[PDB]
Amino acid sequence: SQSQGIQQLLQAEKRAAEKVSEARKRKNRRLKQAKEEAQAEIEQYRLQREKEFKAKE
Amino acid sequence: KQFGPLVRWLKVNFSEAFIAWIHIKALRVFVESVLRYGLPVNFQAMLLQPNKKSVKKLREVLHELYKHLDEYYPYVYYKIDCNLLE
Amino acid sequence: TEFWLISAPGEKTCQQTWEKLHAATTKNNNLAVSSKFNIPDLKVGTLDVLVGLSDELAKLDAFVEGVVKKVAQYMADVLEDSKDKVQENLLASGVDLVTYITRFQWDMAKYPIKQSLKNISEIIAKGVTQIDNDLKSRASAYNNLKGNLQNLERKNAGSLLTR
Amino acid sequence: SDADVQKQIKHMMAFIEQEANEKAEEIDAKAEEEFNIEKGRLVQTQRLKIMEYY
Amino acid sequence: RLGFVAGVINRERIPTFERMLWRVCRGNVFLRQAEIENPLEDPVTGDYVHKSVFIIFFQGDQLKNRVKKICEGFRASLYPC
Amino acid sequence: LPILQSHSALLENMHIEQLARRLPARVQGYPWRLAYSTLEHGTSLKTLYRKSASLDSPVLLVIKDMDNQIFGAYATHPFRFSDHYYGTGETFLYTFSPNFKVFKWSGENSYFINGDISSLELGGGGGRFGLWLDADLYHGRSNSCSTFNNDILSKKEDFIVQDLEVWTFE
């Protein structure tokens, strides 16, 4: 009897820890990717401004 | 000039308030059904109009169909009264 | 006239217990006129919210019953004559109480089933709160004209000593 | 009644699974939102600075 | 998050106590109980009472308040754990 | 079709009718009340939110760029600060070019509006925003986003605001 209820309650806490912890790790990774891909687009916008300046010069 | 608008407004307000009343009943039924049975849901929402001659025998048939599940009832139980107009 | 709303599980699927029930409740005798009822699937979650909803929806049930019953009383108060027609004016969805109860449908346009139970509950509470605000307005509109006409009629009533 | 205790255990296990999923879905919604916020935000923030230098 | 409470009650109260915990939580509560190795002496009368320990499990502070309100209703003694 | 506005606006009378021909029946034929204008109120996003966040109605957002092109959004909910994205399906972006063009919701995401102290933004698509505006109501951005499949709306994606307004149907 009692050992099943203990194991299921411990596994209930395990599910509630894991699903949230995986979502938190995804949130952090998506935020890092947002910054990295933004910088790549910023380099292209910078290169346009520099080419445009060289043309005006 | 108040009476005509009042009767039309009260027709609309009664329809919306009564519809909303049954929506709260449906939500109470839903929330209790979830809390009674858990998330792998397979419950049927059901409507009955009890006959005044047979309402006692109705409770006995309802109990016979559902006594294994567990005023109070082993199934989810709620009511609607049409006497709103007195 | 009274109706009961019930919910219970199937044996494996929802049909199996209900299919046995409605037969016993209609074939032994007419114990009740018996059918399915139209409750949708809704966005469910934590017990902490589902239990909160169980008591909040109960306070709301008492409130919305109070609102709809006050609308019916206001119809009975405006109909100072032709009181037998009150049920033909207290329609819901353009039909009688017993009809819309028996033929109920969830309003998916006013209450989009994809939303949380909390959102749906608040949308109902806001709507019926504005019906209560409209009833405070319409009581003030009706009761002043009623009282003023009763006083005017009283000033015209009685003998030469009072009219 | 041990069978009713097992039903109560199974009921709790169904609710905690959906609670774990519900919390994870909120954090996943925040992940997609903050990506669309932060990527657009950083691009515009620096794109305006280089436009002013240009 | 999940939550839990632990405490002690007179053992003969357990059937009404656990039924009210299920009822107030609209069906669902997990709990267990165990009888004490001796009855416990009343601090004023010296009567010996056959108490039993319990522990109760739930989600969030709203259910903490429901399980606590039923424990108060049966005059049970809760403790931190 | 045509309506009373409580004050002067960035929109011409033909722009009011072209909106009235395409706005929801929930707001068609209502008079429009000014919440915010850069022509009469302090030119900052905090002043816009101070004027519009107290509302509880459908609303119109109207902007003119330094290139004199007219554009903006209609929303079912007031434009305001929020912790998260908000608004509902009748919400759309628009421009006059010089004729009216409308960009209804794609159904792809909830990104109708987001409002921050640092910027106001409408739609979303990674680096894209359907509209974006700075805290000073000076710099903007606008480009096709998956929320609306919109055009550039302003005359240029790199642009300066000339004037901005918020209106309510009441």
From TrEMBL, chain A:
<comment type="function">
    <text>Subunit of the V1 complex of vacuolar(H+)-ATPase (V-ATPase), a multisubunit enzyme composed of a peripheral complex (V1) that hydrolyzes ATP and a membrane integral complex (V0) that translocates protons. V-ATPase is responsible for acidifying and maintaining the pH of intracellular compartments and in some cell types, is targeted to the plasma membrane, where it is responsible for acidifying the extracellular environment.</text>
</comment>
<protein>
    <recommendedName>
        <fullName>V-type proton ATPase subunit G</fullName>
    </recommendedName>
</protein>
<comment type="subunit">
    <text>V-ATPase is a heteromultimeric enzyme made up of two complexes: the ATP-hydrolytic V1 complex and the proton translocation V0 complex. The V1 complex consists of three catalytic AB heterodimers that form a heterohexamer, three peripheral stalks each consisting of EG heterodimers, one central rotor including subunits D and F, and the regulatory subunits C and H. The proton translocation complex V0 consists of the proton transport subunit a, a ring of proteolipid subunits c9c'', rotary subunit d, subunits e and f, and the accessory subunits ATP6AP1/Ac45 and ATP6AP2/PRR.</text>
</comment>
<comment type="similarity">
    <text>Belongs to the V-ATPase G subunit family.</text>
</comment>
<feature type="coiled-coil region">
    <location>
        <begin position="6"/>
        <end position="55"/>
    </location>
</feature>
